[PDB]
Amino acid sequence: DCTMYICGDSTECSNLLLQYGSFCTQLKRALTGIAVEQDKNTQEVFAQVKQIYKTPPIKYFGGFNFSQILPDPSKPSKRSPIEDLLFNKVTLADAGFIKQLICAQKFNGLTVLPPLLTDEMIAQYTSALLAGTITSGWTFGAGPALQIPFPMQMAYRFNGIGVTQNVLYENQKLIANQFNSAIGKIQDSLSSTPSALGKLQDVVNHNAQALNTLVKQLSSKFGAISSVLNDILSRLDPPEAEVQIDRLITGRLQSLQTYVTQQLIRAAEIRASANLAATKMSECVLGQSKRVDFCGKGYHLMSFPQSAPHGVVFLHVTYVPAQEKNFTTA
């Protein structure tokens, strides 16, 4: 808010700022556009399914252990253990939840609006997507969801990468054990690594530091006698208080414009990343992608989405060849 940030509860400063014109309606419109864009980004990435699918109460998928990625009804948040680990590993600065210490030091019109989609229904989108991709293959990414046993779906995902069905139907125990071990150890590697969710933490910290620096700009004189405007109005006559308040207006408005432009560039970068994530969710999850090194490294098999604070985490199940032998060929 220009009305409170640039001028603190002072009628004279607000009247002087009113002369500058649209240097503040533009900022509010740009920030509202950014907020609407971030509201749309989550819907684009996650809300890809018309309906919400639930897994059957029985959990048997031909030996494949999906307990680490399905929601756990015992947990209060109804989130997957990997989702819970992701939530614990990333700490948010603010969420705007009925606030009514650094965040409390923002009595300056700097308010963090809460996201449209709470991280209780984003988990529901994730659960629906994962249930559809484990119980219907890619068939729910085109039209109506078509049931299919998971061994058959995995055999056809093999058939997609040029290995016939018989490999899975003769090594199903081995593939199931390998996939279960990989899913088990991905949690351990994620937790034990000092910082694995570096990108989302950087996304949060960049906004936190931007707001912090914007707050600290109020302590800058900008060539005036003092950096607090209640003192100038109580130390100088209106003829010179005009000039000093105008100088503070110029400085604070320039800082706010810099903040808004940086937010616009950052939001463009985040929108590009969110479009990439939406494409990755459409192709890797709701289908099998033949693009190399797009859905992980190796011949892509499938993918599982997981929610995370201000981001998504894809678990790419891929087929990587192993010990090889020479042969004489013609």
Binding site: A47, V49, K50, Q51, I52, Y53, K54, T55, P56, Y60, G62, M121, Q124, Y125, A128, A131, G132, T135, S136, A145, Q147, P149
Partner: peptide, 13 residues
């Protein structure tokens, strides 16, 4: 969020 429904997953369906 959407129309809640279910699938009919089975071993041989």
């Amino acid at each position: 969020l959407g129309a809640e429904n279910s699938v009919a997953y089975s071993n041989n369906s």
